[PDB]
Amino acid sequence: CTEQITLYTTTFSPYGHRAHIALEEAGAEYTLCQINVKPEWYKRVNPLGKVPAITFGGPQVPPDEPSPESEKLVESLALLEFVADVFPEAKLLPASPVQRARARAFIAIYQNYLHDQFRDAFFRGEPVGPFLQALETLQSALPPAGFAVGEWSLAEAAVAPFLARMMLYLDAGLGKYSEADGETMRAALASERFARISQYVRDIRARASFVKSWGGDDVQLEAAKAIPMLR
Amino acid sequence: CTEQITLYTTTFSPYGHRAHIALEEAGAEYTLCQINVHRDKPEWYKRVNPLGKVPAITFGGPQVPPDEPSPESEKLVESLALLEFVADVFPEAKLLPASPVQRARARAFIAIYQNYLHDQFRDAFFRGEPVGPFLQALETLQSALPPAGFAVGEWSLAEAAVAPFLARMMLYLDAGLGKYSEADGETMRAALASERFARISQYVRDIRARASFVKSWGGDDVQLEAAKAIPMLRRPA
Ligand SMILES: [Mg+2]
Structure with a gap:
């Protein structure tokens, strides 16, 4: 092109x-x-x-x-x-059409079940319970290794920016959630319940295309601390 | 295949x-x-x-x-x-x-439906919320249409995605089904008959003329009977 x-x-x-x-x-x-x-x-x-x-x-x-x-x-x-x-x-x-459909369905899971919870939990301080369940739903659609449909796809392009920020915000203590909900989530993601989704983020953060468009934890972290709705 | x-x-x-x-x-x-x-x-x-x-x-x-x-x-x-x-x-x-550009616009048209109107169809018809947002979202979707024809001129997946929902909301509206108040009921019907919504009115009947829609829709009356059996669509006494 x-x-x-x-x-x-x-x-x-x-x-x-x-x-x-x-x-x-x-x-x-x-x-x-x-x-x-x-x-x-x-x-x-x-x-x-x-x-x-x-x-x-x-x-x-x-x-x-x-x-x-x-x-x-x-x-x-x-x-x-x-x-x-x-x-x-x-x-x-x-x-394959079947695999493109699975990839698209993965993105649907993010949009339809997780995206809004992530926003409710991290930006509105709503109960964290639904977020963790939706995170688990997304995680359950992953195969045991690789990315959403094995090889990297648009599915990763779609969800990587949000999962990467969720973790960064969580590690940094950023978000409008209560101190208690903050602890519940931090232990949630360090527990075995979410071992898969955490490795997925790791494998994402290792991807060159992600590295180049992330700019680094430090820059994102400084941008992060200037978002009113993260307090 | x-x-x-x-x-x-x-x-x-x-x-x-x-x-x-x-x-x-x-x-x-x-x-x-x-x-x-209605069976489990x-x-x-x-x-x-x-x-x-x-x-x-x-x-x-x-x-x-x-x-x-x-x-x-x-x-x-x-x-x-x-x-x-x-x-x-x-x-x-x-x-x-x-072309990729037209494909993108077809998908964007679907996103406008999903981002704006879909939840207002639920909220106005199935939850009884004020209907102003439903109309404004209807206008939003309408504004994406070209002067005539379908979302990107020729029929596309855009219509496959939106037609089932636009047909039902107008079906319900004409017939008075929904949890919305009767005032908001007359407001919607009057708005949809008005010139502000001529374009989306034209789009829905162009949709309804399509063979693939006709065949998969099976007629208003059966869709209407279907809708009258949806309890969430009923107003309390
Ligand atoms: Mg609403």
């Missing part, structure tokens, strides 16, 4: 991180534009200020000067599938 | 309806197995999905009645993944358009 590709994300967004992983896995040639957690020009990417976004094709332009020709795309999971469609050679999904 | 395909769904499920549309659009040789919603699910269904999850598809393995699932068949769940599955199995049906 030779069309130009620009990924727009706010500096520490897990949604942009999704697309960043996928572009790295794809070996894509792309421009990354990070906006500070908003400039007047961004209305030319998306009039509603929606982030992340990808511009595709049109002339090569600096990201703060998006062309009228380029196609503008939003919605992080669609962006994942889009990178895969543009770079089929990279096999960002497995080859 | 030459592997057997069997779709399992509870009768009248919009989620199974999704995959039903897709298999019709694909021209697939498939078997349909409807499970009664045959023991043999554990062999399709042990947690009783529906809808589900079995793929390949030996040709077999649906209540005799083979362990050699691959078993898939989650309705949006099932839509993408059907499309992957039958690339020649072009359930999704050919």
Whole structure:
């Protein structure tokens, strides 16, 4: 693929991180534009200020000067599938329809059962119980080794940014949860109940594409400590 | 394709309806197995999905009645993944358009439905919450439509995903089913008849004209009878 590709994300967004992983896995040639957690020009990417976004094709332009020709795309999971469609050679999904369906179902488990709990527990200080159960549900869909469908796929691009932050926040004591709920979760994730999901995060954090788009625990940790809803 | 395909769904499920549309659009040789919603699910269904999850598809393995699932068949769940599955199995049906950009926009259209309207359909019709958000989300989905035709012009998985739900909410609305107040009832009907919602009104009847939808929908009256048996849809006395 030779069309130009620009990924727009706010500096520490897990949604942009999704697309960043996928572009790295794809070996894509792309421009990354990070906006500070908003400039007047961004209305030319998306009039509603929606982030992340990808511009595709049109002339090569600096990201703060998006062309009228380029196609503008939003919605992080669609962006994942889009990178895969543009770079089929990279096999960002497995080859078999059955395995691509399992990968997609894994992402559904995250979106439909865990995502909202993670937010309730870490950002709203709601009871932590449902979060742990949903984390276990996701964990139960993992095979005993490798990634969600064996090899790395869009499933990892989708969930890695969130699981990695959940752990980091948890290790750092960040989140609106009670001191007691904080302890319940910390012991939850260090217990054997969650050995699998913790190794999964480890294997994720070792992945080059993740390493490059994470920027390091220290940077994420400093961004982390500036989020009002983590207190 | 030459592997057997069997779709399992509870009768009248919009989620199974999704995959039903897709298999019709694909021209697939498939078997349909409807499970009664208000009966507690045959023991043999554990062999399709042990947690009783529906809808589900079995793929390949030996040709077999649906209540005799083979362990050699691959078993898939989650309705949006099932839509993408059907499309992957039958690339020649072009359930999704050919270019990555248009495919992305089809998936984004689905996300707008799931992110905004889906929960407001539940909240306004099944939980009785104020309906303003439902209308605003309806408008949000409407605004993603092009001037005419379907989400990305030609029919695509976008319609397979949203049609089962848009048809039922308008079905319910016309007929007065839902936990919503009667004031909010008249507000919704008046809004949907109004010019503000002409476009989504046009979209739903274009949806309803589609062969694959007609066949998998089985007529308003039976869907209406189905809906009148959903207790969560009823207002208390
Ligand atoms: Mg609500």
